[PDB]
Automatic annotation (TrEMBL), chains A, B, C, D:
Organism of derivation: Cupriavidus necator (Alcaligenes eutrophus)
Main subcellular localisation: cytoplasm
Acyltransferase as UniProt keyword: yes
Protein name: Poly-beta-hydroxybuterate polymerase
Membrane-spanning segments: none
Full-length numbering of the shown residues: 201 to 589 of 589
Localization per Swiss-Prot or TrEMBL: Cytoplasm
Amino acid sequence: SAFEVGRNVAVTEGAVVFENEYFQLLQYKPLTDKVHARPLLMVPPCINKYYILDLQPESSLVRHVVEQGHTVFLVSWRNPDASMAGSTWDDYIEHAAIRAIEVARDISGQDKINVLGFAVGGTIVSTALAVLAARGEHPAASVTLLTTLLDFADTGILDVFVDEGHVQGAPCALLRGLELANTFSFLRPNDLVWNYVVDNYLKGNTPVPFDLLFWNGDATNLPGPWYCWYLRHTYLQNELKVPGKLTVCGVPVDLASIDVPTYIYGSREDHIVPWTAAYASTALLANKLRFVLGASGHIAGVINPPAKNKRSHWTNDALPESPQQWLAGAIEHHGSWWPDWTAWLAGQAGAKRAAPANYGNARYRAIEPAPGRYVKAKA
Amino acid sequence: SAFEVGRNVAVTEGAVVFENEYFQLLQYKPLTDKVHARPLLMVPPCINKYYILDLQPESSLVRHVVEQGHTVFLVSWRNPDASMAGSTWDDYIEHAAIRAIEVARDISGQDKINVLGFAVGGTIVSTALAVLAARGEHPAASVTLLTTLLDFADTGILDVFVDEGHVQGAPCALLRGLELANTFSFLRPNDLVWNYVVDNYLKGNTPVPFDLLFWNGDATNLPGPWYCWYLRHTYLQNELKVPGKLTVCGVPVDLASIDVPTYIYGSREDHIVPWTAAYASTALLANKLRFVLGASGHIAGVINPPAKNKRSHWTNDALPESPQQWLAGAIEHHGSWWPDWTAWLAGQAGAKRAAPANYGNARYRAIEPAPGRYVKAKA
Amino acid sequence: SAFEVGRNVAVTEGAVVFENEYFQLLQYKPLTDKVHARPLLMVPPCINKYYILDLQPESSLVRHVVEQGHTVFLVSWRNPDASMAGSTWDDYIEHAAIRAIEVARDISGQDKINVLGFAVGGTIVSTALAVLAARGEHPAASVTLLTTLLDFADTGILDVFVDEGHVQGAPCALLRGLELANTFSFLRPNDLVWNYVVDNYLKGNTPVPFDLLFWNGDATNLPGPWYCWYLRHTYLQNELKVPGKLTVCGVPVDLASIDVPTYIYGSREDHIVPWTAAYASTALLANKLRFVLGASGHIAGVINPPAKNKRSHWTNDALPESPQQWLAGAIEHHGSWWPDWTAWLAGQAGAKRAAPANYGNARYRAIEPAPGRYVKAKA
Amino acid sequence: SAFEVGRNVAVTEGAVVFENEYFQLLQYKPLTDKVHARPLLMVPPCINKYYILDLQPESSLVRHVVEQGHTVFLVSWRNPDASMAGSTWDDYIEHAAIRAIEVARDISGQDKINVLGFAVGGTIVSTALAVLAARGEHPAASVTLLTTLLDFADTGILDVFVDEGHVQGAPCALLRGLELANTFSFLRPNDLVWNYVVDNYLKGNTPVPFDLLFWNGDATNLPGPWYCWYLRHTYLQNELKVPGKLTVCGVPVDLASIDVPTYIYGSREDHIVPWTAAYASTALLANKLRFVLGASGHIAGVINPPAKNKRSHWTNDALPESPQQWLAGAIEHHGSWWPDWTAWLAGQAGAKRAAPANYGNARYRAIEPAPGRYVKAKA
């Protein structure tokens, strides 16, 4: 049977508890009698859709975390239409990332929550917490950055231009539009012919899994100004990592101001987010950092549920400046890195108490079942 | 003054002597009293337009070759519109590459002509001569391949997919359409935001020259089936280099059947056509081969006129299997590789005779002045 | 307890059945009631000693193969002294590799034997079989090449010399001597200070295993002319892979003349024998080839016994010219590649018969117990 | 005529003005009527000998600087014998680098001198100035680092060990000895066979120049403890770049404490000192930095005298963290970088005054002519 969101993918039980123009907040039904006091808010990429994190039941990171006894909230992004063709990077920071933190924290009744980002979700959520810290607000107990670029050095975009030249910016706000985006071709063509040829080639000549291809093919639109800002200030000019260089939502962005315990994950054969580029976050972030390297590629490495006991991962408590030095002292362990992370997350999440009986609270009651209608909208 | 094709770029004097739906054949006015008996037919890429080879007068390869005493013909590709949305790779081989060889050879009155390809023009013209050889036809005295991919190994398209998968084609003729193409982003996004951000970034933060950016920004459309075939059978499946694997215009393609003296050029810092990938052509082609490596990038290396006496180039008469072995024995020479090539081309071009007084011949008289109206058509 | 050859490493039960100036032939005691008709002759490197293949009982490749029901013979190289300071590459081919094939085949009473090489042992044994084929002799049923260089392209020795030069051999037989050699620093310094600093660094700051370091530290001498020939004609001039280019023991060496079923193994993170360099053997060898890629480094990848169920390996029955194309279509399987190989080897080894009661035969009776005295000799 | 130090190489006119067990201080004869008030002290590598900087007259950096009107002093290292087999890194810092600064400064009568280092000479002289700064001493007006490693990340020594290990220091002062060293094989074998095969191969099959090979073949001894310390604390543990991590001559080493205008040079195709590794010095050093990239290899790039007008070099006044960003904004200029540097050096060297009539001063009179007897001593 073909893949269908809400039928055989993204089926972990939950409810939409909040929605605005930019996103729906999902809250998942408890699967345990007790849960940690502090919930986990997941911020997935808005390049493709969130359900790479809740793919099928056996492979779902959401379901796994719920079964370890955490309350999980998740940002399901709107797939923007013409009405959002002028949305900016700042709009997304304020009205989705910061808003989601506020609503999840309100529902939880806790002073602090745990947060997670994946891929550009990690870049987004890190920017949001840096904005909040400059406002004097510290709503996060800890941060998990899965496969996240903060330092974009050596991602390859300028390679073909370095040796042109003789031997001797225009504001993003001026753009409007919706640009198709996907993960595996985010720095590659996105057109009918490329998509046709690449998809057909991979399905017949490689073991790339079909549910990955379905997720990647379920494309999302990026608003013009948002895509412009992201391309300009990260991949091209690499300014987010320069403390105070960028102003976002009225304040300078200094990633060191986040200043909470942070778990930083990358995959060794990942060529979308090089693992050395993820590791470069250890030079930027304050407080107690942990870096963990999973084996294999961009998705295969992150989505490696422990039950199957496949692959491996490396740990090293020392954090030298150079990633090769880190790997030289690292120990390889059999199987999934997920138990390493969930044990770390448990230490950040407070004591276990009786699970909630209902979704949301008086202010934010259930709207409709997870996965929600936003994730079903086509580009 | 802004760049304008036919006013301050692509201004070498000439005439259109033939045209069909796919291209116009240009013939340039002699600048010398005598010319070699055999003319040179240039086949430029149809990704962007031909005039990278006739950019400004100081930098024009066309003008330089005409001033060395060769009759030059050149393929100026149609910029396809809706009527050509179904054109195929075979259509282009038969009705443009092979057709241009036939018309140029007819006008010249010679039994054989010299041919040149640049970038995908070199792939196109090599395929055409292999098709012709299988028909028992040998219209070329020699072939010059500038910055040409024939073996597409290690061009990078499959990199992000190699480590996806668990631990354990649809015909191009079905597509229609016109897809925007340019050279520096042929394997990169082509959309309004990318083009805006990249162009603005390069102009303000790099010495990439403005006439290069103008040429690259002067985009061309690729017909759906053509783009599908090119992507599938070269970059993805790398089959052109497998003798007899591909059937084109009714015959198997064996690049070894071209079998004429061949000059093979690449640029050392070229990351669009890696110089080692150009060098791999030496393993495929029969007859007497010469490989020459120019310093610098994709365009800077090829467009290096000798008058300025800039950069350098390497030569080595030995042709080991490995490019690093070639470079280890190579000698570096000061300045442009153009004199090396034109001296080689003179040896293929026959004796010098009085230059022609008029364009074309009785069958093919002048239609309109170079650069012709096809090259002025926008995508 | 410290490592000691014959006490807690290299302890698989066996006997020396033959010896000359160059090597001792070991034959291991059967561990099964029946064995395949055709035995396996292992040719280990003479850079360091053989017992990387019989390290500790849990990690021993020899013991594993004996327990799968093969008679195993093995070349234990002399550690040369002053009397051998003039030994040549040809001497080793004739008086050790070819001699070992002859003696093992004689003892077995079989028309053909299976052979295995590891690292330079694979280069040696491939050269020997190519020499034998040119003599009209085909003593091998199949060949297993573990981590073997035949095509030495891109091994890195010329890298630092490629860009020296202005902008514009002495016979190996003349050398005498013994040069210290080890595996991990074969292309690196071998001196008291390097060995002291590197060993101390690895033991205190990495998980490199101590038995690996013991084996690597148990250095062997290379005769001057042998080391000269190996360096010159493989790493530097890469001529073994050129059919007929080199003359060895009176005949031209054409590796395609070996022409038997061949199993070719490499390890993905191996930077001593790059896996792509091992893969390049598929372009040289005739008959039915299988290529298998193990995960991890030079030794960790090869020495991965299946009982522990660690790591992974890739298979692909297609053999494209390019290794990246091979990997793109490859399937990753959990755990050790050893079962893949032993199942392949069983298909080459004939039917199972009662195991031999005694070592050797009338001509070659047991001399002394394995591991033999040659392997205990210090450099 | 064969190369001979003091006859046709290292012939710039000068005198030894000081000597101790570790080195001779050379002072060159003026070639101009006036010289800058501040002299330049050159600290060459002690791996091979100094005269790579005074090779032949046309190629001599020393002669070129003297002809631009600077007084040049130079450290000519002792080639250590058995009496120095216990010399340490600290011994060399105190009794050669710091001593040479003191003597050159005394002879000059100036409060500050300019200093230059090349290769390990740059590492040595940077350490010495950092030691002096911690003592409250600032004898340098400016520093020139040619092809110098300070940050040794990614130099490749740990590559072969990173993927060994299961799935789960001894003081340098204890060594004695003299270890042969050269530049192009400093991380490669140094033995009779390697040297024989490599030298013979390069001379017959590459354009590597013979005077380079002569210099490289003129090997120097490294004392055991010195070589141990250098290997351990730079290439292996990369600690010099960690402020205060290493204690040298009784004080912590913080390279930021040097704090003088600094010219940092690297060569683009240099694989002994990667240009990106040289560039990494810009992250360590205080005060006004300039980085300049020369084209070509380790020696070809540095030794590029301007008279011949060969090669090119890049400049960029911006200093981003990433070297690729630096190169993307860099402008390529024709020919040698030497005029760029000497113009920079003139700005550091004070006003021009009448040249000295005699070598040295009352305390330090001429001992013997340059090049001196130390440089003639064989290993």
